[PDB]
Point group: D2
C-alpha cells in the first residue's frame, strides 16, 4: 500500500504580519531549518514517499525551489495550488487526482510533531486499511480548534469546530490519516458558515460511522503550531535545546531517507559536497560513520 501524503501549506492570513508579508509562513525558520521540513519529516517517518505540497499560486515556486521533486531524498514530491484558504478539506478536492484510489494523510505545513515512539504511532495509523485516524492533544486554548468530547473512558463522543464552550481541552491535531473514502466525503460536505470546507465535518462523519480512531497523543509529545510571534520563537528555542544537547538534528530529511534506505551513502555524500564547510553538510557526512539505535 502506497499511502499518499499531502502537506497543506497555503495562505495563513495576516496574524503574523509583517514577517509573513513577503515570505510564506512555512518557509520561515524554526531554529535552523525552514518550518516545512518538520511536517515533511513527520510524513517521511510515517513511511510516506509520495507527497503533494499545496500552497498559494504565488508561493508554489518558492516551495518548489526549496524541495524540488524529492528525488534527492528518494521521494516523489509534487505541487498544486490553493487560490484562497477555503478549508482544510479542500485539500481532497485539489489533491483528488494525486490521491487516486489510495489511502492518504493530510498534515498542516506549520505543525511540528515531536516525541518518543512517534514513528510507531504513525506507522500503526498508516498501516490500517479501513477507517481514519486523528490525534487528540491537551492544549491551553482548545477553543481555537476542533475539540474532542470524551466520555469517562476517553472514548470520543463528538468533534466540534471552535466551540464557544469546549467540552474538553483535547484538540484535534493537524495530522490526519484516511482510507479511500475521504475524497468522496469531501465532495459530499458543504462549506460552513465561515465559508470553509471543514475537516471536522469529514472527521465527525467517520466518527458517526464507528470508523474513527481518536488516538490520545500524551503530554510527553510536543505538538506545536506557530500561531503567534511568541509561540513561533518558542518552538525554535525548543528545537535548539534538544539539538544542542543531543548532537542530533530534528527533522533532517536526508537523515530519515538514508536510515530508511531511500538513498545510499554515495547520494548522502553528493548532497553533502556543496555544504562541506557548514554545519548541515558536516551533519550529513557524519551520518556515514555514526551509530544510533
Amino acid at each position: 500500500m502506497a499511502r499518499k501524503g499531502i502537506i497543506l501549506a497555503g495562505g495563513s492570513g495576516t496574524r503574523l504580519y509583517p514577517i509573513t508579508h513577503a515570505v510564506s509562513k512555512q518557509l520561515l525558520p524554526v531554529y535552523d531549518k525552514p518550518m516545512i521540513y518538520y511536517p515533511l519529516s513527520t510524513l517521511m517517518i510515517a513511511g510516506i514517499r509520495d507527497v503533494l505540497i499545496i500552497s498559494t499560486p504565488q508561493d508554489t515556486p518558492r516551495f518548489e525551489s526549496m524541495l524540488g521533486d524529492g528525488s534527492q531524498w528518494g521521494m516523489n514530491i509534487q505541487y498544486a495550488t490553493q487560490p484562497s484558504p477555503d478549508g482544510l478539506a479542500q485539500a481532497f478536492v485539489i489533491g483528488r487526482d494525486f490521491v487516486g484510489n489510495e489511502p492518504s494523510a493530510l498534515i498542516l505545513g506549520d505543525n511540528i510533531f515531536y516525541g518518543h515512539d512517534l514513528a510507531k504511532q504513525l506507522e500503526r495509523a498508516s498501516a490500517k486499511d479501513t477507517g481514519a485516524t486523528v490525534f487528540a492533544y491537551h492544549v491551553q486554548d482548545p477553543e481555537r480548534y476542533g475539540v474532542v468530547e470524551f466520555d469517562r473512558e476517553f472514548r470520543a463522543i463528538s468533534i466540534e469546530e471552535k466551540p464557544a464552550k469546549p467540552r474538553s481541552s483535547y484538540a484535534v491535531t493537524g495530522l490526519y490519516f484516511y482510507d479511500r473514502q475521504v475524497c468522496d466525503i469531501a465532495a459530499d460536505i458543504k462549506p460552513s458558515a465561515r465559508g470553509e470546507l471543514e475537516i471536522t465535518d469529514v472527521n465527525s462523519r467517520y466518527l458517526a460511522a464507528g470508523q474513527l480512531d481518536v488516538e490520545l497523543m500524551g503530554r510527553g509529545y510536543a505538538w506545536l503550531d506557530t500561531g503567534t510571534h511568541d509561540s513561533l520563537i518558542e518552538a525554535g528555542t525548543f528545537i535548539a535545546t534538544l539539538q544542542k544537547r543531543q548532537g542530533l538534528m530534528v527533522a533532517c530529511p536526508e537523515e530519515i531517507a538514508y536510515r530508511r534506505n531511500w538513498i545510499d551513502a554515495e547520494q548522502v555524500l553528493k548532497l553533502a559536497q556543496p555544504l562541506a564547510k557548514n554545519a548541515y553538510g558536516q551533519y550529513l557526512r557524519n551520518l556515514l560513520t555514526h551509530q544510533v539505535a
Copy 2:
C-alpha cells in the same frame, strides 16, 4: 517496594555565585524548584520511599521544601553528604535506608522528560537481579560515563570521562539496582580523581554479565544543569511545553493524586493555603479537569 535516593549534594563553585548561599537543587527550573523534577521521576517509577541526601547545611532547606512526604502519600527521609566525594557514596550514606531492598538512585539536578517514560521506568523497576542504566546520545559524551557498543545491541564497556569516548551514549543520572549495590559500593575504592564512582559500581555488574543498558531515544529530553546556559535553557524548555499544553511538568501533587496516593480531599487541603496563585488553581483544576493518564 523499591527505595529511591535523590543525590542532591554539593555542586562546587562551578555555578558561582548563584550557588554560593543556596544549593543548586533548590534553584528554579522555570516555575518550580529543580528537585521537583527528579522527585517526580521517582514517583512516576512508582517509588514512594525516598531518601534526600544533601550537604548538612542544606538539609533543613530541603526539609522545609519537601517535609516527610506524607502530604503526597510518600515517605521522604534525609541524610547528609558533607563533601561531594562520589555518586557511589549514595549507597554508603544510604545503606541503612536501602536495607535489604531494591533501590534506585537519581541525581537531584537531572531532568527526564518524554512520552512513555513510565513504561520504561516500570520495566527497569521490575527486574529482580542485576542493574539497569540508561544510555542517551549527547553532543559531548566525554563529560560523562560513556557506553561502548559492539556492532549489535550489547554494551561491552562503561568508561568514566574517557579521552576517546567509544560512543556518543552517555550514562544518565538514573540507576536501578538489585540488593547487591550496597555491598559493591562498600567494596570499591575511590578513583584517581578521588571519588567513589558509580561507573565502578556499574562495571562490577557489567563484568558479572548483570548490567542492562536501556536506550533512551532522541524523543526524550535528558537535561542537566551544569552551566548557567544549560540551567536557563532547561527553564525555557519546560516553559514552552507548559504554555502550550496548559499542563504542568513534575507537579508532585498531580502525580500522587492520579496514582491514588492522595485523594481529592487532600488535594483541596493542599490547595487551600495557595488559593490565590496559579499553583493552587492548578491543584484545584485536578479535581474538575479531564486529563488522560
Copy 3:
C-alpha cells in the same frame, strides 16, 4: 554621603513554589543572584553604605551572600521586616541607619540597565533638596504607582494601582530622597490596602513642588520579575548582552575596582578562592583587560 536601602523582604506567594524555601532576591537571574543587580545600581550611583532589609529568616542568607561589604570597600548592614507592610516602612525600619543623611531606596528584585544610567543616577544623587523618582513606559501600568502628566508633560499627580491608568508611565523601584523622608514616612498612615505607601511619600514631595519625575526612556530596561515568565526573560536578556560583549552586568567587584574602592591586590584575593570558575577568571581579567 548618601545612604542606600535595598528592600528585599517578603514577596508573597505569587511565585510559589520557587520562593517557598528560598527568598526571591536570592534566586538566579542568569549567572548571579537577583540582588546583585539592584546592589550594583546603588554602587553605580556612588552609594557605599547600604542597609539590606529582609524577613527575619532570610537575613543570614543575605549576610552569607554579601557579608559586611568590606570585601568591596563598602559597608553593608542588615535589618529585618517582620511583615511586608509597605515600601515606606523601609524608612521607619532604616531610620537610625539613615540618620540625617540623604538616602535612596531600591527594590531588591528590580533590574535597571542602559546607556548613561550612571550619569542619570549621579544627577539624582546630587540634588540638595527634594526627591527624584523615575517614570518608565510599561505594558501594565495599573500594577504600579502611575504618573499623571499635564499637557506639557510635567508630572502633576501619582496614584497607586489606578483602576483606569492616566498614562502608561510607572514609577520605577528606585527613589532618591533628601533628609525629610524619614519624618515623612513616620507621618503617613496605612492605606486602604493596609500598607505604608511609597506613593504617599512621593505625592507629598510632588505636592510641595519638590519632586523631580525623570523619564526613563525606552532605551533602558527596567525589569522586575513578577511572573515566572518575566523572571526567565530577564535572565535570557542579561545572558544575550554578556555573551555578546564579554562583559558582565552587575559585577560588584568590577564596579568597586573601577571606582578605586578596592585595589588590584584586593581583586586578586577575591579571585583566588574562585580561581576554578568563570567568575574568578573575570575578576582576574579586570587587571589585564
Copy 4:
C-alpha cells in the same frame, strides 16, 4: 540630505538551509523582518533616501517587502550586487545614488539598540568633513575590524580580522562618510581576500586625521546574526523589551510618524488593512498614545 545604503546582499551558506528559502535579511527577528531594524536605524539618524543593495535574485523580494518607501514618507531605491566582493563595493554600486552628497552605510543584518542612540547618530550625521565609525566591546573581536587604542585611548589603526587582536573593540556595521568616500572606494584595491575592504576605506580617513571613532558603551546592544543561535537570541532579546514596555522596537511607521514624514491620516490608511492583527492595533494606538517628552 544624507543618503543611506543598506547592504543586504549575499550572506553565503553558513545558515543553510534557512537561507536557501528566504534571503537572510527577510528572516524574522521576533515580530518583524530583520531588515526593519537597520532600516529604522537610518530613519532615527534622519535619513529618508535609502538604497537597498542585494543579490539580483533577492532584489525583487526586498521590493515587495518595502516598496518605494513612500508609505513612510521615504524614498527607497534598489541596486544589485552579483557577488559579495566587499563592503566598500556599496560605494561603487551606489555611486550614482550617493551623487555628491554625504552618505551612511549600514549592514542589513545589524541590530543597534539603546538609550540616546538618536543623539549619537545625529552628531555623526552632522559632521561636515570626514567620517565617523563606532567601536564596541565584543567577546570575539577577531571576526571584525578591530580598533587599536593608545594609552590615552585614542584610535591608532584598524586591522581587519587580525590573528592577534589589539583590543576587544570591533568596528560596528554602521558608517558615516562625507563626499570623499565614493572616490576613495574606487581608489582602493582588493585585499588578500578578493574583497574591497571597508577597513581600508576607514584607514584612509584615519591616516588623513578625518576619522572619528566613537565608543559605543556596554549599555547599547549591537547584535548581528551570523549563526542560528545569535539569530534566535536577537529575537528573544527584542521580545523581552517589547513585552515589558508595550512599545515596539523598529516600527518604521512609528518613527516616520513621530518625525512628521507621514501624518495621522496616513497612519490610519496603513492600519486599516491590518485592523485585525497586533501590528495594526499598534499603529492605531500611535494616534492616541502618550509617549512623548
